[PDB]
Amino acid sequence: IETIVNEFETRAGTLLRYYTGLLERSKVQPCCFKLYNDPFDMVYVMMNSKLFSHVYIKDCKVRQSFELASPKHTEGLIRSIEGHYVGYELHDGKQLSISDMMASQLFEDEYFMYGLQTYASSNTDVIANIEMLYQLATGINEPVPELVEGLKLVTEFVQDENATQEDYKALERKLNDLKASYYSLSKLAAAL
Amino acid sequence: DIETIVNEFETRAGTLLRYYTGLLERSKVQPCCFKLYNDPFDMVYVMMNSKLFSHVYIKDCKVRQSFELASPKHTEGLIRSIEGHYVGYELHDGKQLSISDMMASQLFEDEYFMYGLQTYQSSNTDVIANIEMLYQLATGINEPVPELVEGLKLVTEFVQDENATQEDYKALERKLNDLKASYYSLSKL
Ligand SMILES: [Cl-]
Ligand SMILES: [Cl-]
């Protein structure tokens, strides 16, 4: 596990550069690295021309990583680069910084929740959702602990316990606790 | 034989990178050619042999000379134009310079660049390397002020020299120097 040093203002950028860098080499030989002082503490794997990532969980055996990029699909990485500077306009008018964009996907997606339940545009596919959370995460410098803990609990839950209804609802209260500190209640309230 | 693709990101540097790494596979087994819709710099773009080259459309002039924007281990030039689009460049005096001023400065405010154009082991920066940085910077500028479009088109057409003469250099220089004065709101002198 090479830890490599950041060469851009965004992790998404350093990741885009190595991804193309290592793309060829990766078809014959899996590469594997960390970024220095990654606030999200991800392990990155280049295998077979794809980039994968999972936040590191100590207790937990990881049997499941998440795709950051494929050859014809780098727009995830690129969009976190742009998004990191100017956030995101949703099609119904509004504007979200990359952190609120991620907080939204993590805490205000009932389709996502529903899919987590069921585990043990609007998507309902748990892995797709997480992958996209991962992509946002690579554009965010100094994330509030609730994005960090949020991404870790979701990525843990899916490393299967053949997870039970109990593990799901334990998770659904934890995320609510975090949705609670992340957003001021009185703001959730004016959003209906 | 020029496919046209439509801007997919706030910046051309961004779209360029998505396509570059998307077409890496085909470009070895085939050359590869295209254009961004409404590119203010009118670049024609070629992927060939795992690299991406560019040149500004001239075409009265036939182009012996094209310019490398990326290669598989060297995409940072383009990524940097994304960052510098939003936030510009931090100089050794703690000041912050925009991508436009940075392009301006490389094009108009650099005398090693000029002498090398006169001319057209090691040295500080070769002429083609200079113009490549200029092209790379260009892809990060949204609504480029005319002197930048002009300057880049000039210097580009110059370098397809056909053994261009002392006279042609001096034609270039006066114009660059005009464009300079307009760009900087120099009072003359
Ligand atoms: Cl950070
Ligand atoms: Cl434009």
What DSSP string runs through chain A? -EEE---SSSHHHHHHHHHHHHHHHHHHS-EEEEETT-TT-EEEEEETTEEEEEE--SSS-----EEEEBTTB-HHHHHHHHHHHH-EEETTTEEE-HHHHHHHHHHS-HHHHHHHHHH------HHHHHHHHHHHHTT-SS--HHHHHHHHHHHHHHS-S---HHHHHHHHHHHHHHHHHHS-HHHHHHT-
* d(C-alpha B67, C-alpha A149), whole Å: 46
The position carrying tokens 């969009």 is A79
The CATH superfamily holding the domain A1-73 is Putative mobile pathogenicity island, N-terminal domain (3.30.1300.50)
* d(C-alpha A136, C-alpha A186), whole Å: 26
Helix/strand/coil for B151: helix
B25:A71 CB<8 A: yes
Comparing CA positions, the residue from B161, B81, B77 lying closest to residue B116 is B161
B83:A16 CB<8 A: no
B83:A21 CB<8 A: no
* d(C-alpha B137, C-alpha B16), whole Å: 13
> Which of B17, B19, B87, B98 is the best substitution to test chain A (most A C-beta atoms within 10 A)?
B17
* d(C-alpha A173, C-alpha A76), whole Å: 29
Ligand lying closest to the C-alpha of residue A144 = 1
Q: Which residues surround ligand 2, an ion (CB under 5 A)?
A: B 40, 143
> Which of A23, A48, A78 is the best substitution to test chain B (most B C-beta atoms within 10 A)?
A78
A8:B80 CB<8 A: yes
Residue pair B78/B69 in contact (Cβ under 8 Å)? The answer is yes
Residue pair A150/A177 in contact (Cβ under 8 Å)? The answer is no
Phi, psi (deg, nearest 5) at residue B103: -70, -45
CATH for the stretch B1-74: 3.30.1300.50
Strands B96-97 and B43-48: unpaired
CATH topology of domain A74-192: Methane Monooxygenase Hydroxylase; Chain G, domain 1 (1.20.58)
B76:A8 CB<8 A: yes
Helix/strand/coil for B67: strand
Strands B32-36 and B3-5: parallel
DSSP label of B71 = B
Residue pair B148/B107 in contact (Cβ under 8 Å)? The answer is yes
A78:B14 CB<8 A: yes
Torsion over CA of B11, B1, B146 and B179, rounded to 10 degrees?
120
CATH topology of domain B75-189: Methane Monooxygenase Hydroxylase; Chain G, domain 1 (1.20.58)
A110 CB within 8 Å of a chain B CB:
no
Helix/strand/coil for B168: helix
- β-bridge mates for residue A66, sequence order: A53
The amino acid sitting at B39 is D
B79:A13 CB<8 A: yes
* d(C-alpha B140, C-alpha B102), whole Å: 11
Ligand lying closest to the C-alpha of residue A37 = 1
Ranges of H-type helices in chain B: 12-22, 24-29, 76-87, 99-108, 111-118, 127-138, 146-159, 166-183
- β-bridge mates for residue A156, sequence order: none
- β-bridge mates for residue A45, sequence order: A32, A52
Strands A31-35 and A2-4: parallel
Close Cβ partners of A180 (under 8 Å, ≥ 6 residues apart): none
Close Cβ partners of B18 (under 8 Å, ≥ 6 residues apart): A74, A75, A78, B8, B9
Residues of chain B neighbouring A88 (CB-CB closer than 8 A): none
Q: Which resolution in angstroms does this entry have? A: 2.5
B110 CB within 8 Å of a chain A CB:
no
Residue A36 class from Cβ within 10 Å (0-12 exposed, 13-18 middle, 19+ buried)? exposed
* d(C-alpha A63, C-alpha A66), whole Å: 11
Nearest residue, CB atoms, A9 vs list B22, B75, B83 = B83
Residue pair A126/A115 in contact (Cβ under 8 Å)? The answer is yes
A13 CB within 8 Å of a chain B CB:
yes
A74:B21 CB<8 A: yes
A74 CB within 8 Å of a chain B CB:
yes
Strands B89-90 and B96-97: antiparallel
Domain boundaries, chain A: 1-73, 74-192
* DSSP-derived secondary structure for A56-74: --SSS-----EEEEBTTB-
Comparing CA positions, the residue from B99, B75, B89 lying closest to residue B16 is B75
DSSP label of B87 = H
* d(C-alpha B113, C-alpha B108), whole Å: 9
Comparing CA positions, the residue from A52, A21, A49, A45 lying closest to residue B76 is A21
CB atoms inside a 10 Å sphere around CB A17: 22
